[PDB]
Design a binder for these strands. Structure first.
Lengths: 192, 192
DNA sequence: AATTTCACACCTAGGTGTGAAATT
DNA sequence: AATTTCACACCTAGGTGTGAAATT
DNA sequence: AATTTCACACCTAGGTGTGAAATT
DNA sequence: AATTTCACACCTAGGTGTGAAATT
């Protein structure tokens, strides 16, 4: 039941300790290393919902002194928002999840909360805050009673080694390097 | 506490008795009479998630003989079908919900499950099935132990007088009429 | 200063036709 | 020679960071 | 036959600037 | 002696169903 492992787990540790940074943009920008993993403990020909939402870890504004992330200003001071990203290939068979990684390699991030009457499905984030991706797998039934006090599955998965900071441009220069090497669209800039 | 009433309430009943029909299309089509209502029982400086998802009412295929909706084939279902639709202006303060108008007037519906690597956010439905709009209000707290501050939320609302059938083109002709008089984009076609 | 946007050189990801080469 | 297949130069379409320039 | 797509005449919905228009 | 107000033509941009035509 419920076994959700992380693939690329090493890569997340690598970006984590040196405090992770995702660049956000008006047009949109994908996560790197884009959240991507593995699930088990499910029923094969039953099927399920998979979307991810990036929740906010705390209220505070942030800044980069002397290569150090530090709080600034004061709380203003929500807790998610966030705008969901449901797998392009969800819903789909329980077994179909287990046949593959569940990659979110195209999830985009941005700064336009007036996102062009939508036609987006991309997370819209504010620069310089600390967030945390969270993925759920709500299971979906047929047949609809009155019920009582119970409304499981009330199901949520979080990875804390996937926190990050929304930045308009990279700060720590280790991270730019870390990106540059692991990013295939970025290898123009290593032989440089 | 928890009070979510329906506006267009009468309009939904008019469309209901004569078995509701929403037109779905490759490019997209917005609901009519689009899910739109009123909310209470929430706190002002708390804030909450409002998205709607259309769940599928039952497995079976459907057809219009003899001015009658009737089942066909037997169960198949690419699901319990759905695709979430979060309000363009979510998340937002409790007072902002209780404000005014929580309309879902631009929600579009369609038939491309290969929806152009998203950049859409529109429900993709199967032609000739009966579905049901359903809206949830997930509220978001402070504090993340394992796992309660103590506070986490478990909340979903359904409207049954809002079922419908996805059609590529209208069947019953009273509904085609019912739309024409009540739809402001459709008044080319009535004093005729 | 702090932050954000911009054009741009540099790359991947994936689809076609050509002139050379295989192989019949 | 007829016929088939093919690396490679050639395409679109888009993701990366850079350093300058705009903007708060 | 059953279903889906298509250009089209007819409308809303909304942002600009014109020629007309009263008035500190 | 212009500067305020103002109805309106006009624009895009997009939403509706219709009847005919394509595609299953």
């Amino acid at each position: 039941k419920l076994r959700v492992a992380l693939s690329n787990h090493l890569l997340w540790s690598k970006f984590n300790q040196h405090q992770t940074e995702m660049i956000i943009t008006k047009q949109g920008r994908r996560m790197f290393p884009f959240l991507s993993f593995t699930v088990a403990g499910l029923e094969p020909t039953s099927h399920y919902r998979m979307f991810v939402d990036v929740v906010l870890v705390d209220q505070h504004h942030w800044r980069y002194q002397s290569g150090k992330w530090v709080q600034c200003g004061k709380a203003e001071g929500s807790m998610p928002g966030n705008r969901l990203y449901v797998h392009p290939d969800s819903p789909n068979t329980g077994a179909h999840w287990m046949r593959q990684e569940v990659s979110f390699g195209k999830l985009k991030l941005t700064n336009n909360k007036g996102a062009s009457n939508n036609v987006t499905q991309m997370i819209v984030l504010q620069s310089l805050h600390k967030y945390q991706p969270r993925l759920h797998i709500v299971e979906v039934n047929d047949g609809e009673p009155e019920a009582a006090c119970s409304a499981s599955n009330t199901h949520v998965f979080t990875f804390q080694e996937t926190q990050f900071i929304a930045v308009t441009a990279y700060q720590n220069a280790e991270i730019t390097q870390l990106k540059i090497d692991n990013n295939p669209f970025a290898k123009g800039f290593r032989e440089n």
